[PDB]
Design an enzyme around this catalytic site. Structure first.
Site, short mmCIF file in Angstrom:
data_model
loop_
_atom_site.label_atom_id
_atom_site.label_comp_id
_atom_site.label_asym_id
_atom_site.label_seq_id
_atom_site.Cartn_x
_atom_site.Cartn_y
_atom_site.Cartn_z
N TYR A 147 -9.15 3.83 -3.30
CA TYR A 147 -9.58 4.26 -4.62
C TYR A 147 -10.85 5.10 -4.61
CZ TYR A 147 -6.21 1.28 -7.12
OH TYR A 147 -5.08 0.70 -7.67
N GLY B 7 4.02 8.16 -20.22
CA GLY B 7 3.70 9.57 -20.25
C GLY B 7 2.92 9.92 -19.00
N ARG C 172 1.56 -6.68 -7.47
CA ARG C 172 0.59 -7.68 -7.06
C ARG C 172 0.12 -8.66 -8.13
NH1 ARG C 172 -2.98 -3.10 -4.24
NH2 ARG C 172 -2.13 -3.11 -2.12
N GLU D 264 5.12 10.13 -15.99
CA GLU D 264 5.96 11.33 -15.92
C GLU D 264 5.15 12.49 -15.36
OE1 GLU D 264 7.70 11.57 -20.14
OE2 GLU D 264 9.48 11.49 -18.83
N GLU E 287 -0.23 -2.21 -7.86
CA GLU E 287 -1.06 -3.19 -8.53
C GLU E 287 -0.21 -4.03 -9.47
OE1 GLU E 287 -3.56 -3.61 -7.04
OE2 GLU E 287 -4.93 -1.94 -6.89
N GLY F 176 -6.13 6.77 1.30
CA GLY F 176 -5.58 6.42 0.01
C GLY F 176 -6.40 5.43 -0.78
N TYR G 292 0.81 -1.21 0.00
CA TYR G 292 0.00 0.00 0.00
C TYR G 292 0.85 1.28 0.00
CZ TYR G 292 -4.67 2.06 1.03
OH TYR G 292 -5.88 2.72 0.98
N1 LIG Z 1 -2.91 3.74 -1.73
C1 LIG Z 1 -3.09 2.49 -2.13
N2 LIG Z 1 -2.06 1.64 -2.20
C2 LIG Z 1 -2.22 0.39 -2.60
N3 LIG Z 1 -3.41 -0.09 -2.92
C3 LIG Z 1 -4.48 0.70 -2.86
C4 LIG Z 1 -5.85 0.57 -3.10
C5 LIG Z 1 -6.57 -0.69 -3.58
O1 LIG Z 1 -7.66 -0.94 -2.67
C6 LIG Z 1 -7.34 -2.13 -1.92
C7 LIG Z 1 -7.83 -2.08 -0.48
O2 LIG Z 1 -7.47 -3.28 0.21
P1 LIG Z 1 -7.91 -3.51 1.74
O3 LIG Z 1 -9.47 -3.14 1.80
O4 LIG Z 1 -7.63 -4.88 2.22
O5 LIG Z 1 -7.15 -2.37 2.59
C8 LIG Z 1 -5.82 -2.21 -1.99
O6 LIG Z 1 -5.41 -3.55 -1.71
C9 LIG Z 1 -5.68 -1.92 -3.48
O7 LIG Z 1 -6.25 -2.99 -4.24
N4 LIG Z 1 -6.42 1.74 -2.84
N5 LIG Z 1 -5.58 2.56 -2.49
C10 LIG Z 1 -4.36 2.03 -2.47
#
Ligand SMILES: Nc1ncnc2c([C@@H]3O[C@H](COP(=O)(O)O)[C@@H](O)[C@H]3O)n[nH]c12
Ligand SMILES: *[C@@H]1O[C@H](CO)[C@@H](O[C@@H]2O[C@H](CO)[C@@H](O)[C@H](O)[C@H]2NC(C)=O)[C@H](O)[C@H]1NC(C)=O
Ligand SMILES: *[C@@H]1O[C@H](CO)[C@@H](O[C@@H]2O[C@H](CO)[C@@H](O)[C@H](O)[C@H]2NC(C)=O)[C@H](O)[C@H]1NC(C)=O
Ligand SMILES: OC[C@H]1O[C@@H](O[C@H]2[C@H](O)[C@@H](O)[C@H](O)O[C@@H]2CO)[C@H](O)[C@@H](O)[C@H]1O
Ligand SMILES: OC[C@H]1O[C@@H](O[C@H]2[C@H](O)[C@@H](O)[C@H](O)O[C@@H]2CO)[C@H](O)[C@@H](O)[C@H]1O
EC number: 3.2.2.22
Lengths: 257, 259
Positions: A118, A137, A175, A140, A172, A116, A75
């Site tokens: 999504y 791009g 992963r 950058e 991602e 953080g 993360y």
């Molecule tokens: N700042 C970040 N860093 C890594 N992954 C994520 C995500 C995504 O959302 C998922 C939330 O997973 P968890 O609900 O187990 O915390 C992350 O595993 C990734 O798939 N959102 N924000 C992220």
């Protein structure tokens, strides 16, 4: 903390593949592999000196930024640009204390009001992952946007959009070999393009897949996990074998018998 | 949280040619045969199996049992309590093998015909010995991408890599075979177990061990029996040859199932 570095400068498919190979190598210790897939360290009992890895991205413009990833889940928790550091609003007391050990140098430490995840990020960006393009791009541009937020010349919507890009092309990617390849394709042909339904779906299912696989009966799942194809059609996964070439890292869920 | 708690899923067992592990004529008297049979879309217990924690595979309450611990005996349905305890024990491996830990004999289907009786044979990782626990009766169709971003393509008897034009679509069967979507009774085959045999496309008929593959986590496509991996001869797509070769991990041995 270890420091892997990547530059979009002479960015190439090989350089990108080494970069990710480097990130996966620093996240896992090789001690725990299930059904041939490496598992990330258990959060409970992990010393803070092995809790984060530092990714340093740099572009053509000579601008540089350092992302900090939590090893227990890959993360992106925050970053450093110049003399300042910004962190995503921690979502539990433990994490809040942990981040305290990152970028101790910096004179200015700021903690964003938002997390953080999504959802929150897409909201702030005023865009869905489906509309934000990915590629070298975009990487950058994201690095620049990230760098200047420290000086004051980057609006919040753009900051958030930049985060969505870095998280996908780095976290991602580490992963899922599938997603790494997707990014590799964009670099290979100099394409800027939003992720397909299959990518979005794999991203949203990491946790579920990690669980299904780890608490399965000899690779058999108790409940099917539903995934998408590039064209958007669905298909169900009942066994771990088909995933073996797709997932590269799994978040720890439970201990082996 | 806690130690991993494994479940007991009720699932179908697909194998050779995509057929299903079936209890003959839906009858459950002790000794009735287990056979391959076109998979059904419904809930007939004779085609559904529960993977118990004790390592027994059960259909409608009875146990998948081996007649004996010798290559050739048949698999039958039988009362779990009456039968020889460790003759109802099996392990389902990640590489599609279902083994009887005692004789080390594997669940097999020495014939791809509908109605064939299941038996336990000596493990040689053949297509006649590959299975998969799944409710998913259809094979997985994908695009296999490799060296330089090129795609694995088949043109009748041969197979090579070439630029991807969106047939280069392949069907991954439960029995572990890789079949060209347009002609599903043809298998990605490899004549020998020798360090350079040129992989071709022959009929899945023999269901040989040279027709069974497995996608590993490291991006390679492994031939379980030989220990060798698909390799694009000398990183030269031009040569138009995919060979078997020992693992080294360079870009010419790495593939990705693009779905
Ligand atoms: N700042 C970040 N860093 C890594 N992954 C994520 C995500 C995504 O959302 C998922 C939330 O997973 P968890 O609900 O187990 O915390 C992350 O595993 C990734 O798939 N959102 N924000 C992220
Ligand atoms: C495969 O399909 C079968 C039948 O559709 C599923 O079996 C049912 O599973 C539920 C929950 O596990 C049970 O309560 C039902 O009694 C079962 N139906 C039957 C046969 O009566 C099975 O779970 C499916 N496999 C998976 C894991 O999705
Ligand atoms: C197929 O998968 C099984 C999974 O166990 C492999 O057999 C075991 O392999 C491990 C090494 O990873 C050994 O420690 C065990 O002794 C093996 N036997 C058993 C019953 O656990 C088997 O090697 C795989 N087949 C191939 C050729 O890859
Ligand atoms: O053996 C093949 C096939 O048998 C079905 O059972 C039939 C049986 O063959 C017939 O004699 C009886 O009257 O009706 C049964 C149900 O239609 C099984 O259902 C099927 O799974 C196969 O096992
Ligand atoms: O024998 C196939 C083998 O070729 C290697 O590539 C060699 C090739 O043999 C020849 O062109 C010369 O030796 O240079 C190439 C670079 O090594 C591959 O490395 C190997 O994977 C096989 O494909």
């Amino acid at each position: 903390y270890p420091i892997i570095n990547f530059t979009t400068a002479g960015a190439t498919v090989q350089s990108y593949t080494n970069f990710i190979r480097a990130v996966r190598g620093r996240l896992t210790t090789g001690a725990d592999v299930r059904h041939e897939i490496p598992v990330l360290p258990n959060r409970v009992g992990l010393p803070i000196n092995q809790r984060f890895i530092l990714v340093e991205l740099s572009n053509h413009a000579e601008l540089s930024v350092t992302l900090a990833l939590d090893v227990t889940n890959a993360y992106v928790v925050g970053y450093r640009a110049g003399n300042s550091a910004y962190f995503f609003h921690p979502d539990n007391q433990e994490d809040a204390e942990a981040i305290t050990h990152l970028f101790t140098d910096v004179q200015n430490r700021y903690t964003f009001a938002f997390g953080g995840n999504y959802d929150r990020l897409e909201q702030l960006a005023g865009n869905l992952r489906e509309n934000i393009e990915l590629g070298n791009g975009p990487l950058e541009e994201a690095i620049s946007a990230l760098y200047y937020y420290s000086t004051g010349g980057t609006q919040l919507p753009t900051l958030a959009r930049s985060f969505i890009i870095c998280i996908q092309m780095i976290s991602e990617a580490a992963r899922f070999q599938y997603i790494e390849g997707e990014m590799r394709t964009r670099i290979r042909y100099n394409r800027r393009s939003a992720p397909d339904p299959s990518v979005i779906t794999l991203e949203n299912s990491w946790g579920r897949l990690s669980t299904a696989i780890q608490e399965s009966n000899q690779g058999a799942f108790a409940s099917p996990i539903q995934l998408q194809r590039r064209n958007g059609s669905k298909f169900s996964v009942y066994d771990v074998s088909i995933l073996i070439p797709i997932i590269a890292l799994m978040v720890y869920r439970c201990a082996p018998p | 949280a806690d130690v991993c708690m494994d479940p007991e899923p009720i699932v179908r067992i697909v194998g050779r040619n995509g057929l299903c592990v079936d209890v003959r004529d839906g009858r459950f008297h002790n000794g009735n045969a287990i056979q391959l049979w076109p998979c059904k879309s419904n809930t007939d217990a004779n085609q559904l199996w529960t993977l118990k924690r004790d390592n027994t595979i059960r259909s409608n309450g009875k146990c998948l049992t081996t007649y004996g611990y010798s290559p050739g005996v048949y698999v039958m349905i039988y009362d779990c309590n009456t039968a020889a305890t460790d003759a109802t024990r099996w392990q389902i491996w990640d590489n599609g093998t279902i083994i009887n830990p005692r004789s080390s004999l594997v669940l097999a289907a020495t014939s791809g015909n509908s109605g064939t009786t299941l038996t336990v044979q000596t493990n040689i990782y053949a297509v006649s010995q590959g299975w998969l626990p799944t409710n998913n009766t259809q094979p997985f169709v994908t695009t296999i991408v490799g060296l330089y971003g090129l795609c694995l393509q088949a043109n009748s008897g041969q197979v090579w890599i070439e630029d991807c034009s969106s047939e280069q679509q392949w069907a991954l069967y439960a029995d572990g075979s890789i079949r060209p979507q347009q002609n599903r009774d043809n298998c990605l085959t490899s004549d020998s177990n020798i360090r350079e045999t040129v992989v071709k496309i022959l009929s899945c008929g023999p269901a040989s061990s040279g027709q069974r593959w497995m996608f590993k986590n490291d991006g390679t496509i492994l031939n379980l029996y030989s220990g060798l991996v698909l390799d694009v001869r000398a990183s030269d797509p031009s040569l138009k040859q995919i060979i078997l070769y020992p693992l080294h991990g360079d870009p010419n041995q790495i593939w990705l199932p693009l779905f």
